[PDB]
Structure formats: structure tokens, C-alpha cells
Tab-separated table of C-alpha atoms in Angstrom:
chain	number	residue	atom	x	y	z
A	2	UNK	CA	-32.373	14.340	-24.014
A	3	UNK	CA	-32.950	17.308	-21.677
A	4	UNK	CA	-29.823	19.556	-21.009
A	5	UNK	CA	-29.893	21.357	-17.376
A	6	UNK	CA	-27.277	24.117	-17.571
A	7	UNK	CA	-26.029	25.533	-14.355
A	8	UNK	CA	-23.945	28.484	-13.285
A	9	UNK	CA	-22.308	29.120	-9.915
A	10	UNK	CA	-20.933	32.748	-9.761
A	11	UNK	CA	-18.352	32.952	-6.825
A	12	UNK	CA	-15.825	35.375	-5.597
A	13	UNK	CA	-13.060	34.406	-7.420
A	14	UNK	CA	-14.432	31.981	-10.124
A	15	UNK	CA	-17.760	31.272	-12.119
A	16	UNK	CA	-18.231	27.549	-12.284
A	17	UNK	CA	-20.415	26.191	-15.188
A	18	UNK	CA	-21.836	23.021	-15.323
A	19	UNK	CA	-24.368	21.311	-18.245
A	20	UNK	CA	-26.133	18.216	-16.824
A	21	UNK	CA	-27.867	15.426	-19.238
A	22	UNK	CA	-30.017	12.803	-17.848
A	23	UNK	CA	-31.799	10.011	-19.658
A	24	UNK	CA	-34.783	8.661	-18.385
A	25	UNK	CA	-33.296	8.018	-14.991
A	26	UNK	CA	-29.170	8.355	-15.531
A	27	UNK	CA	-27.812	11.621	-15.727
A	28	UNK	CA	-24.174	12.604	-16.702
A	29	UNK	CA	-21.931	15.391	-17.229
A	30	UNK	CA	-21.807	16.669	-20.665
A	31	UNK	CA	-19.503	19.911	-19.737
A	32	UNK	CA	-18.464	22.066	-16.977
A	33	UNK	CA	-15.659	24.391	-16.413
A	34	UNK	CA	-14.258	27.445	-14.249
A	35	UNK	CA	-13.358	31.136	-14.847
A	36	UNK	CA	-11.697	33.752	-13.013
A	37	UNK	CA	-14.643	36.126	-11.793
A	38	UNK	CA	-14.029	39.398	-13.294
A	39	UNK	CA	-15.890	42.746	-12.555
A	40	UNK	CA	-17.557	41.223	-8.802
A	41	UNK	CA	-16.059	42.629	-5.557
A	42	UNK	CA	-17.063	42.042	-2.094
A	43	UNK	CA	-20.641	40.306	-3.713
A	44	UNK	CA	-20.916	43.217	-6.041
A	45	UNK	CA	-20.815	43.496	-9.606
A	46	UNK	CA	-18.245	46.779	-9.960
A	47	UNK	CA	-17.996	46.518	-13.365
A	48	UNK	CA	-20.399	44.863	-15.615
A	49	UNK	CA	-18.615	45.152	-18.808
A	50	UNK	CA	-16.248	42.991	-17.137
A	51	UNK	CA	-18.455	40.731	-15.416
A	52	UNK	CA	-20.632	40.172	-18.353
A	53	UNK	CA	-17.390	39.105	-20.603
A	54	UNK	CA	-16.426	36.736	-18.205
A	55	UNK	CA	-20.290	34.717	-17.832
A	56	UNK	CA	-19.975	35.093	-21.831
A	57	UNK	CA	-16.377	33.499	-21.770
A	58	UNK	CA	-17.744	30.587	-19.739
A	59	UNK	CA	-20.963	30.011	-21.482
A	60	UNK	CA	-18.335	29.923	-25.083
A	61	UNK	CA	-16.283	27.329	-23.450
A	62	UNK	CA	-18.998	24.867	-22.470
A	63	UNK	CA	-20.475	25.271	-25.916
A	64	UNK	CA	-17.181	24.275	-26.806
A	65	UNK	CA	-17.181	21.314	-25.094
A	66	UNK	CA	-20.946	20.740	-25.876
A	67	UNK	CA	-20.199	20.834	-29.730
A	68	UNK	CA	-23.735	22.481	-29.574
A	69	UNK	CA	-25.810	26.014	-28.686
A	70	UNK	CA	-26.791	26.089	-24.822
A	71	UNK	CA	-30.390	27.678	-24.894
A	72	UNK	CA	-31.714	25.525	-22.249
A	73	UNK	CA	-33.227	27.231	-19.179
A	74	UNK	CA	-30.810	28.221	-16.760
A	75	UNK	CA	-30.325	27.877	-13.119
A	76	UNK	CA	-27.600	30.010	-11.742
A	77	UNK	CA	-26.198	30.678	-8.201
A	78	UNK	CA	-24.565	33.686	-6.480
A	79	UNK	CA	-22.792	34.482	-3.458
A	80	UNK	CA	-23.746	36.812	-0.818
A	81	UNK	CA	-23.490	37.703	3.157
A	82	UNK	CA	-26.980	39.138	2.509
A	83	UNK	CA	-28.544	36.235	2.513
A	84	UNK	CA	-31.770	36.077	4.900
A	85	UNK	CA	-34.429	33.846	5.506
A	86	UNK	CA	-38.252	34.820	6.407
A	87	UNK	CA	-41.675	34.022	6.958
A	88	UNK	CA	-44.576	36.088	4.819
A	89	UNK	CA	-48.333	34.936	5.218
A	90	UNK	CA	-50.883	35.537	2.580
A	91	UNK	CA	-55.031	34.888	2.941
A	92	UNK	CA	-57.900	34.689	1.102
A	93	UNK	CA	-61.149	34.466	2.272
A	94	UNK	CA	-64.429	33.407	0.355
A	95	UNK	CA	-66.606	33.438	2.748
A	96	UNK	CA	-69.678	30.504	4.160
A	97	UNK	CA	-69.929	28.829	0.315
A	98	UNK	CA	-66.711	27.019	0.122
A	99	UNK	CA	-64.228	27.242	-3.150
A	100	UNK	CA	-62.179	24.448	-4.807
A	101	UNK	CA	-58.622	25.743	-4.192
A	102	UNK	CA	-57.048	25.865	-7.988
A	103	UNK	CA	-53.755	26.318	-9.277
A	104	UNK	CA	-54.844	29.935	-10.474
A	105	UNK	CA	-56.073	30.680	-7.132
A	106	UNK	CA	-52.518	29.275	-6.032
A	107	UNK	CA	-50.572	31.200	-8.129
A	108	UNK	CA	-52.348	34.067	-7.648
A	109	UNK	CA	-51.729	34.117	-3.838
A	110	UNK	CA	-47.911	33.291	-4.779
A	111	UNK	CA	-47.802	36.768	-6.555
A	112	UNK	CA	-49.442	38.678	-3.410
A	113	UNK	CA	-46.073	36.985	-1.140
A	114	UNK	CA	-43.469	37.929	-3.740
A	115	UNK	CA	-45.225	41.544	-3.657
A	116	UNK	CA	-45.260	42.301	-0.426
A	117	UNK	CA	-41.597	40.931	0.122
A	118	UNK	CA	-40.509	43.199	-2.597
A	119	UNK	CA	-42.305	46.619	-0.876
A	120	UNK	CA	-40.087	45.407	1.915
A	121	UNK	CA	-37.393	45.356	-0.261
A	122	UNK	CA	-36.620	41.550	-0.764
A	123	UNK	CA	-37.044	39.210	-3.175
A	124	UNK	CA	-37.022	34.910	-2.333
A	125	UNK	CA	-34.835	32.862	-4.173
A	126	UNK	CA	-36.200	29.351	-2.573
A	127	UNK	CA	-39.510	29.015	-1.142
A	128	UNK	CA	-38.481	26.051	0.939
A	129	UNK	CA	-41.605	25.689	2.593
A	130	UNK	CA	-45.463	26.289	2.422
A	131	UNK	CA	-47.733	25.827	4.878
A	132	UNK	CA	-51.877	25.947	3.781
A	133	UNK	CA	-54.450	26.950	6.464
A	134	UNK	CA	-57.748	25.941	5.732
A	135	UNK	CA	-60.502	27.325	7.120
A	136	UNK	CA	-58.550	28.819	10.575
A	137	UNK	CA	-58.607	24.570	11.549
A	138	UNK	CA	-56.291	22.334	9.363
A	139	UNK	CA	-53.521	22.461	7.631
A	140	UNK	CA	-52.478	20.684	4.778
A	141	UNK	CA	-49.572	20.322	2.711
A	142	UNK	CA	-51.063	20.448	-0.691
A	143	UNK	CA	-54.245	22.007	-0.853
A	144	UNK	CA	-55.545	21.536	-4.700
A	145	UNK	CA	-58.231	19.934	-5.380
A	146	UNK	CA	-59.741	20.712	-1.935
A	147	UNK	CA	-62.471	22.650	-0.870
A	148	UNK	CA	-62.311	25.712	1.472
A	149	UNK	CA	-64.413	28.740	2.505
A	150	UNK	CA	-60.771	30.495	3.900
A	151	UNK	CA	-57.442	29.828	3.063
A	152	UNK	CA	-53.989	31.193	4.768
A	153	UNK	CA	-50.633	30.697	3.269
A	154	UNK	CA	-46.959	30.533	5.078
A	155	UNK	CA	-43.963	30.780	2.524
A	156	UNK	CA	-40.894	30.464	3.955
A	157	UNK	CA	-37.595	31.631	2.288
A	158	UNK	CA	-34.438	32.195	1.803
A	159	UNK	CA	-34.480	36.080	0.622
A	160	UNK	CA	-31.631	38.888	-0.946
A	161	UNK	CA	-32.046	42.446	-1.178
A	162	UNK	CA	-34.374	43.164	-4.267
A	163	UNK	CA	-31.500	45.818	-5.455
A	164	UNK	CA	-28.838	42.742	-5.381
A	165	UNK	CA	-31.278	40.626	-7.065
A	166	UNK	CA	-31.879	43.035	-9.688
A	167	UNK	CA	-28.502	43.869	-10.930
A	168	UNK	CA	-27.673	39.880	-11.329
A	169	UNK	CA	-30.888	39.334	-13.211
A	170	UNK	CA	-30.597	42.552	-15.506
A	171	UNK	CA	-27.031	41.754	-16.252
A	172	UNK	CA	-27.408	38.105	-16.668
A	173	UNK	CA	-30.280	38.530	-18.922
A	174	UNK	CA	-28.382	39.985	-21.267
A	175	UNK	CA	-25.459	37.708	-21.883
A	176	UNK	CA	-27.768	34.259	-20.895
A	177	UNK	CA	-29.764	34.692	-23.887
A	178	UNK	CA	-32.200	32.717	-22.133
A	179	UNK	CA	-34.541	31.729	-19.071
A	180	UNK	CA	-33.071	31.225	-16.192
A	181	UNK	CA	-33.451	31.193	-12.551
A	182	UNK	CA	-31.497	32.998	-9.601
A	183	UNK	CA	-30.511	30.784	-6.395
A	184	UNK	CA	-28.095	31.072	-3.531
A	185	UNK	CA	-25.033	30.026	-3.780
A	186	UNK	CA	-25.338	28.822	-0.139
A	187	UNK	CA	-28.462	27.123	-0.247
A	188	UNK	CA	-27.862	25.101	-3.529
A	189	UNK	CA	-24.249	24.204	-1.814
A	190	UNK	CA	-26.074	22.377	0.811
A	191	UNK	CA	-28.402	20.759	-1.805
A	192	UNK	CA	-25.591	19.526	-3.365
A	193	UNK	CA	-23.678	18.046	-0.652
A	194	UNK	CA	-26.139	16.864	1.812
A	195	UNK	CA	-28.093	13.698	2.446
A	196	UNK	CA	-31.389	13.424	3.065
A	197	UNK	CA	-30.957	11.723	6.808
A	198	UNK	CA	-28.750	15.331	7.562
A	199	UNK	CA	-31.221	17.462	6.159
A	200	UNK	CA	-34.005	15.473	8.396
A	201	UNK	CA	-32.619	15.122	11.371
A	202	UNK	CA	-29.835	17.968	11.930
A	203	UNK	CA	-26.353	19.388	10.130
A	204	UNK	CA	-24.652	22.323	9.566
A	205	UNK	CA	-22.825	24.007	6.297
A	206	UNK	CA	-19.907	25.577	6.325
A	207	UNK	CA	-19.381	27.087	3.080
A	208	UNK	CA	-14.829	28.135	3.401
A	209	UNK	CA	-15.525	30.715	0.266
A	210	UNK	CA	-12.904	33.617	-0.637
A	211	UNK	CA	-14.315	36.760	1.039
A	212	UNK	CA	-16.123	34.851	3.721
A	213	UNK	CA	-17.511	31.917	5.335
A	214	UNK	CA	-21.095	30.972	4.594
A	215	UNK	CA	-23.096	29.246	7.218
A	216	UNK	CA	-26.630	27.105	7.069
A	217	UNK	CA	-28.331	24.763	8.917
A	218	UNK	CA	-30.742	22.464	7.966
A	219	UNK	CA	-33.442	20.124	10.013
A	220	UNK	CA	-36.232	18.594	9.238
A	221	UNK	CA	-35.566	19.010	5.852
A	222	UNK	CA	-35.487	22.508	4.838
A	223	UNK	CA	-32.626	25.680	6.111
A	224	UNK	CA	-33.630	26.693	9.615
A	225	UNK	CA	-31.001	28.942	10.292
A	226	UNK	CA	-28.841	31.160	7.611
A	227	UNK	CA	-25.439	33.416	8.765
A	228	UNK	CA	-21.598	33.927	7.824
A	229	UNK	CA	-18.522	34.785	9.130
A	230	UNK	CA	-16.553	37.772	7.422
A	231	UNK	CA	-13.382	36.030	6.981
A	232	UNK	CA	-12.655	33.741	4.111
A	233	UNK	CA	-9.524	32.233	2.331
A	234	UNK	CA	-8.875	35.731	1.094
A	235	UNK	CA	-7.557	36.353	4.672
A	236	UNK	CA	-5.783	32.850	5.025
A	237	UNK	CA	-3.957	33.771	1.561
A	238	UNK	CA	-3.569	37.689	2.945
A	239	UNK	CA	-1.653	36.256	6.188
A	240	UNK	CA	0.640	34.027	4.315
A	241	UNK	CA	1.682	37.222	1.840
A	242	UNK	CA	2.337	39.339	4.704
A	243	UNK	CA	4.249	37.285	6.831
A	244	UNK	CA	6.649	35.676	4.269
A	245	UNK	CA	6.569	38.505	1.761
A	246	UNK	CA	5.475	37.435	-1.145
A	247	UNK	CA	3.072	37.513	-3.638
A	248	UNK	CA	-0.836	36.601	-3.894
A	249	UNK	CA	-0.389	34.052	-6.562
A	250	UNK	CA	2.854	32.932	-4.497
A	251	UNK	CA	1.366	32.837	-1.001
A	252	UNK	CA	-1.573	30.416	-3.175
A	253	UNK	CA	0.300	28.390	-4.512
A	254	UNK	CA	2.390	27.794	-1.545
A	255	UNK	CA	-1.135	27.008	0.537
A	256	UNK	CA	-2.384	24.595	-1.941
A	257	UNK	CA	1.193	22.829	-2.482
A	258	UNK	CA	2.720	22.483	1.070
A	259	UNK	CA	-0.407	24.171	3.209
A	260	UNK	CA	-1.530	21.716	6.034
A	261	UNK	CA	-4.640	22.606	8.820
A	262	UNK	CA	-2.568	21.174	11.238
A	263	UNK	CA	1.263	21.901	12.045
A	264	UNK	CA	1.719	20.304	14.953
A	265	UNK	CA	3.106	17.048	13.771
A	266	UNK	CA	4.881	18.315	10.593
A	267	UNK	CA	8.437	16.972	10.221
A	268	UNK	CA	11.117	19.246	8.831
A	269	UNK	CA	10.623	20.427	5.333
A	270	UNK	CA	12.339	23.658	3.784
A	271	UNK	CA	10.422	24.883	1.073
A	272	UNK	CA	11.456	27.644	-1.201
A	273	UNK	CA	9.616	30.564	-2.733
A	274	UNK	CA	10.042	33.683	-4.789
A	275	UNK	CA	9.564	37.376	-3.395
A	276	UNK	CA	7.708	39.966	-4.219
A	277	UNK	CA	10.801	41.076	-7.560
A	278	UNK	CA	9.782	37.421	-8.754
A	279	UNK	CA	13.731	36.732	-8.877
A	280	UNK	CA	14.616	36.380	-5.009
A	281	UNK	CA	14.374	33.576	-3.774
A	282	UNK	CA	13.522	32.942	0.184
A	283	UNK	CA	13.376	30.155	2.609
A	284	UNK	CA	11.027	28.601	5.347
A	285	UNK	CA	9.238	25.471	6.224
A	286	UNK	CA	5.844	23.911	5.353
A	287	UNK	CA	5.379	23.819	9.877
A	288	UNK	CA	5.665	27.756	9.451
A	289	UNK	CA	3.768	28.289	6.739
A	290	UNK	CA	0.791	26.081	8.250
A	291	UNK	CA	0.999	28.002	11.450
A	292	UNK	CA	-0.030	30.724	9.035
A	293	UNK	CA	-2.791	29.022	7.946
A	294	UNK	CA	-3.706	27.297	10.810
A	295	UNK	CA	-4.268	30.208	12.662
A	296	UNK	CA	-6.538	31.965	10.264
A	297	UNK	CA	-8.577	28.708	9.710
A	298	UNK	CA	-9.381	28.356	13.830
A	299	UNK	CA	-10.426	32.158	13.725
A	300	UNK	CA	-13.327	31.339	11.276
A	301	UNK	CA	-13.944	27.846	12.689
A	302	UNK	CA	-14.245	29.719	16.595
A	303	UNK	CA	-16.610	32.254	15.178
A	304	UNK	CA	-18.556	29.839	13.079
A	305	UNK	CA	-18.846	27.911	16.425
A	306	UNK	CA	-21.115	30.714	17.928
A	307	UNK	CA	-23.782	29.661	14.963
A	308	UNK	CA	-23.216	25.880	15.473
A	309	UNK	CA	-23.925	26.512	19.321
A	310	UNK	CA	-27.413	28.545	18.604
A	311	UNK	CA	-28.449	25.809	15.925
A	312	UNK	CA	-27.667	23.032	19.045
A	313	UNK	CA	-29.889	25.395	21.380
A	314	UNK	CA	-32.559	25.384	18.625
A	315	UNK	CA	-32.558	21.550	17.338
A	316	UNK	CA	-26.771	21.169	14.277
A	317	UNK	CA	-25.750	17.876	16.509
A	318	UNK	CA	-27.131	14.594	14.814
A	319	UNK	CA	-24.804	15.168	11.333
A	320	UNK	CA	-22.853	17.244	12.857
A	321	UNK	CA	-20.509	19.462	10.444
A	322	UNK	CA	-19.710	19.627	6.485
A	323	UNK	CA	-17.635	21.768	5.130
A	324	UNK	CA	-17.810	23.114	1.866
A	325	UNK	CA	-16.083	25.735	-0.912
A	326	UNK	CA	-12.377	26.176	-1.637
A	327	UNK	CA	-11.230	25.784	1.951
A	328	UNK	CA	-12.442	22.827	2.161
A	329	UNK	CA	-9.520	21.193	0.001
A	330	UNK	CA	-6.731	22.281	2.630
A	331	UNK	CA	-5.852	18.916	3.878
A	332	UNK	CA	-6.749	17.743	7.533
A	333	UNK	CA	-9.164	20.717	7.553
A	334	UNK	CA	-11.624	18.265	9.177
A	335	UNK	CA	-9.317	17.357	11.494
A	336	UNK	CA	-9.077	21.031	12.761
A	337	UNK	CA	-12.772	21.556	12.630
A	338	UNK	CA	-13.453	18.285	14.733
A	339	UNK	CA	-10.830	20.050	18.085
A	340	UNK	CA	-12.783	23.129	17.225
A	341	UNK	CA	-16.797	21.901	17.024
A	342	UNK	CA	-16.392	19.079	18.657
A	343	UNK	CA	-18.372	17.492	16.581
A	344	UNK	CA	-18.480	14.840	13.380
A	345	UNK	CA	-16.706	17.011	10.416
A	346	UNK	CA	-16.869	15.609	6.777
A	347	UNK	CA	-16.358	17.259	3.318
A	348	UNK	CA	-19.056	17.922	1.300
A	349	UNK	CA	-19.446	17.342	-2.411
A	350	UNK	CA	-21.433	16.126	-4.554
A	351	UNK	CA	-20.665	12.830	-4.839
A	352	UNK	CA	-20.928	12.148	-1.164
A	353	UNK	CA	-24.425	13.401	-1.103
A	354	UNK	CA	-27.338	10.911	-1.473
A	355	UNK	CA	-28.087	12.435	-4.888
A	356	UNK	CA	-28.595	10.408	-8.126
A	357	UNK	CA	-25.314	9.191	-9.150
A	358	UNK	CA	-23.881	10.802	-12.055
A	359	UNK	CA	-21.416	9.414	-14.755
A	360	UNK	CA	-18.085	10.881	-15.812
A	361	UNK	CA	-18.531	13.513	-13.588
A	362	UNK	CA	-15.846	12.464	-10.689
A	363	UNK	CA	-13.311	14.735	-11.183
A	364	UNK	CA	-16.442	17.653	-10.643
A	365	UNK	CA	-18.801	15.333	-8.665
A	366	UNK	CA	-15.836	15.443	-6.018
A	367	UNK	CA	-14.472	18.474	-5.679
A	368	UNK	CA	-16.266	20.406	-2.797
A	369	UNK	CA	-16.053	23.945	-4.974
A	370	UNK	CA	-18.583	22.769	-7.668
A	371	UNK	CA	-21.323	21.602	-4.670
A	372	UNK	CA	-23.313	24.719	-5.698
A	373	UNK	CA	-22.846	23.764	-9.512
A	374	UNK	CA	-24.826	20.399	-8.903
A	375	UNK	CA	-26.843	21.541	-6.111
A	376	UNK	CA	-28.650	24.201	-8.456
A	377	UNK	CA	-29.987	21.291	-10.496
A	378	UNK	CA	-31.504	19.056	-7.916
A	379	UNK	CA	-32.841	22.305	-6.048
């Protein structure tokens, strides 16, 4: 039995996830959340913190597991740095042509992740490569061919190498053991998409904390990467400010009586405490979604702008999924639909085409564990 453990560090919470898979049937053996302690904005501000919440995770899925976690890792991160690019790499042997090897291969592999880093990047999915051979064809698998020349396109989805490096070296240290980094974006979309939407045309819309995440995919692989600097940090912000409450009021409020759409909302009072946790206050669950509704169109009308330059570039055929935290405010869809005027579904992983997995629903649904699974099937 082989145990894939995966990590998704977000804003606000660190999701954890241990997949087990027999032959050809996988299941969930454990997965859990945490609050996301020393990270701000991206950043890890404090990695005595940080570190003790990973460790606090990693203890409670051992917990559940009954057993050590040592296998390799795959673990996720979010950040508006996020970038994809092209870098080409060739070697030439000259008239006598060379079997192409997977030293040769791997070689050439090391020359791309060297230059990106003296440009101060490094790749956390090589989505694509592209081999050249001999300035005429090109082939998608070039072992056990023979060329006198061969040129190599990577394309990926790169983060600054100084981001990269703090997550590794502080990761390293509390996941005694391998792992890999990925975005948090990119394995979202793994996990929620099918394969006819990453063929043909769709568009991501990750509704994180600090901000939105946006990717597009066609033809199978990302095409287009952004975000939008408002999140559900903002949405919960408004709500605070205008009724005067608390955070953890405002968010509980959202989740309990918050609606995407007000304008049909019969009468309902709803009652909350202020900010001395004693008062108590008044108003309706129509005001407090015109709150949230307006916050929600602001990111949906700027995420538009990157929808429209994916439809110049092509993401029309599948249209819209939306992912992450905000993606649980109900009608959401229906709000995104007036706004892209488009197909809108939610993503997660069970409504992906990925292999099924057992006793996993109440994970395999939820949109904010997407990146979780998605890691795993990268």
C-alpha cells in the first residue's frame, strides 16, 4: 500500500490530506485543517510560528493514521507571484548523430532550471516540453531516438526563487522528509477540472482569503496565469465595518445567513453581538448580503477582464469554475453567471473526472481541499 501525503498551505488554513490507493482504488486514509499561523500576505512572518502549525497538522494526521507519515510529500502554496514562462535549452552534436538518453535528458533539464534561477525563478510544474530535433521535427518524447541537434521548450508555471526558498528551507525542517513544492493554483485546477475543460477551454477562479487566483487552461495545460487583489478577507472586512462587529462575528454571520444574491430575500431579522461581545444588534440577512454581494461582483468584474483576454486568445467552451472558500457562499454561481456570462459551476474534487475515491465525500466535495487532491494527481 503506497501512502501519498499532501499539504495545501493557504492564507488562513493548512489543509492536509494522506491518500492510499490499491492497485487501482484509492481512498482517504486522513486529512484535516489548521489555522495558518506565522504566513501574511503569502509570506512566512514568523517561522517559529509557521513551522508549529505544519508540525501540528502533520501530528494530527498521524493521529488519525495510527502510523509515522514518512512518505514523500507533495505540498502546495499560495501566491499572487505566480508566473508562467517559456525557457529553451540546446545541444548540439554535430553531423554523427547521438541516441537521445535519459542522462542526456536530465542533463539538459538542469541547464533550464539554471538559467531560470540566474533570472531569479524557480518552476514548480513543467507543464509542457517541446523536443526539436535536428532544426526539422518535433517530437513529444524523444528517447530512444537518434539526433545530430536537439532543442528543448519547457514551459512553466514559475515563483520567485527567494519565495521558493524560504518554503523549502522551512518545510524541510519540520517534513522530515522528501517532498515537492507546487502551486496552490495550479494543483486547484488539477483537482477540479475535467479533462474535456482542460482540452478544449475553462477558466479557474480560485475565491481565496487575501485574493482571487485566476488560470486558464486549453489544450490541456495553463495558458494563462493572473489574480485579483481582493479576496474573502475584504467580503468579511465589509461586513465588520458596516454592522460593527467582530471578524469571527462578521464570519460567522456570512457563512450562516450570507447569500450572493439579495434580491429575492424575504424578510429575516437576524441578530448578532458587537464588538463588547455582550450587545446585541439587529439587521436582516437582505442587508447583510448586500454586503456581500457587493464585494463578490467587485472581484467577479475584475476577474472578467482575464476571462475576456483568455476568450481573445482561445475561456468559452467550459466556461467558469470557481474554486476556494468563496466558493461555498450559496448562489455564488448564480452571481458569476449575470457577471461572465458564461456557464459557472463549483469545482471540487469530486466533480472532476479524476479516479473516484472512497470515504472521502465530505473532503472530495468541498471546493477548499481542490488543491489537497489536485497535488496528488499533478
Amino acid at each position: 500500500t503506497v501512502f501519498y501525503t499532501s499539504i495545501d498551505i493557504g492564507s488562513r488554513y493548512i489543509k492536509g490530506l494522506v491518500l492510499g490507493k490499491r492497485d487501482q482504488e484509492w481512498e482517504a486514509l486522513a486529512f484535516s485543517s489548521v489555522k495558518s499561523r506565522g504566513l501574511d500576505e503569502g509570506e512566512i512572518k514568523d517561522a517559529i510560528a509557521f513551522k508549529e502549525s505544519v508540525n501540528t497538522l502533520l501530528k494530527e494526521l498521524e493521529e488519525q493514521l495510527q502510523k509515522s507519515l514518512r512518505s514523500d510529500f507533495v505540498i502546495s502554496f499560495s501566491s499572487v507571484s505566480f508566473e508562467r514562462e517559456d525557457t529553451v535549452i540546446e545541444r548540439d552534436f554535430g553531423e554523427e548523430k547521438r541516441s537521445i538518453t535519459l542522462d542526456i535528458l536530465s542533463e539538459m533539464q538542469s541547464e533550464a532550471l539554471e538559467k531560470l534561477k540566474e533570472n531569479g525563478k524557480t518552476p514548480l510544474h513543467i507543464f509542457s516540453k517541446r523536443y526539436l530535433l535536428d532544426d526539422e521535427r518535433i517530437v513529444f518524447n524523444p528517447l530512444d531516438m537518434k539526433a545530430s541537434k536537439i532543442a528543448i521548450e519547457y514551459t512553466s508555471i514559475v515563483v520567485p526563487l527567494k519565495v521558493y526558498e524560504m518554503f523549502y528551507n522551512f518545510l524541510q525542517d519540520t517534513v522530515k522528509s522528501p517532498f515537492q513544492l507546487k502551486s496552490s493554483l495550479v494543483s486547484t485546477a488539477e483537482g477540479v477540472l475535467t479533462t474535456p475543460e482542460k482540452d478544449r477551454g475553462v477558466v479557474v477562479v480560485n475565491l481565496g482569503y487575501n485574493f482571487t487566483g485566476l488560470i486558464a487552461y486549453k489544450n490541456g495545460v495553463p495558458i494563462k496565469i493572473s489574480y485579483v487583489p481582493v479576496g474573502m478577507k475584504h467580503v468579511i472586512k465589509d461586513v465588520s465595518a458596516v454592522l460593527d462587529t467582530s471578524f469571527e462575528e462578521s464570519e460567522r454571520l456570512i457563512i450562516t445567513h450570507g447569500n450572493a444574491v439579495y434580491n429575492d430575500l424575504k424578510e429575516e431579522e437576524i441578530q448578532y453581538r458587537g464588538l463588547d461581545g455582550n450587545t446585541i444588534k439587529t439587521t436582516t440577512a437582505k442587508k447583510l448580503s448586500v454586503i456581500i454581494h457587493a464585494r463578490l461582483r467587485e472581484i467577479m468584474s475584475k476577474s472578467k477582464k482575464f476571462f475576456r483576454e483568455v476568450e481573445a486568445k482561445i475561456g468559452i467552451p467550459g466556461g467558469v469554475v470557481l474554486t476556494g472558500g468563496g466558493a461555498k457562499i450559496p448562489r455564488i454561481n448564480e452571481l458569476a453567471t449575470e457577471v461572465f456570462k458564461s456557464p459557472v459551476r463549483t469545482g471540487c474534487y469530486a466533480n472532476s473526472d479524476r479516479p473516484s475515491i472512497i470515504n472521502a465525500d465530505e473532503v472530495a466535495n468541498d471546493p477548499s481541499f481542490a488543491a489537497a487532491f489536485g497535488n496528488v494527481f499533478a
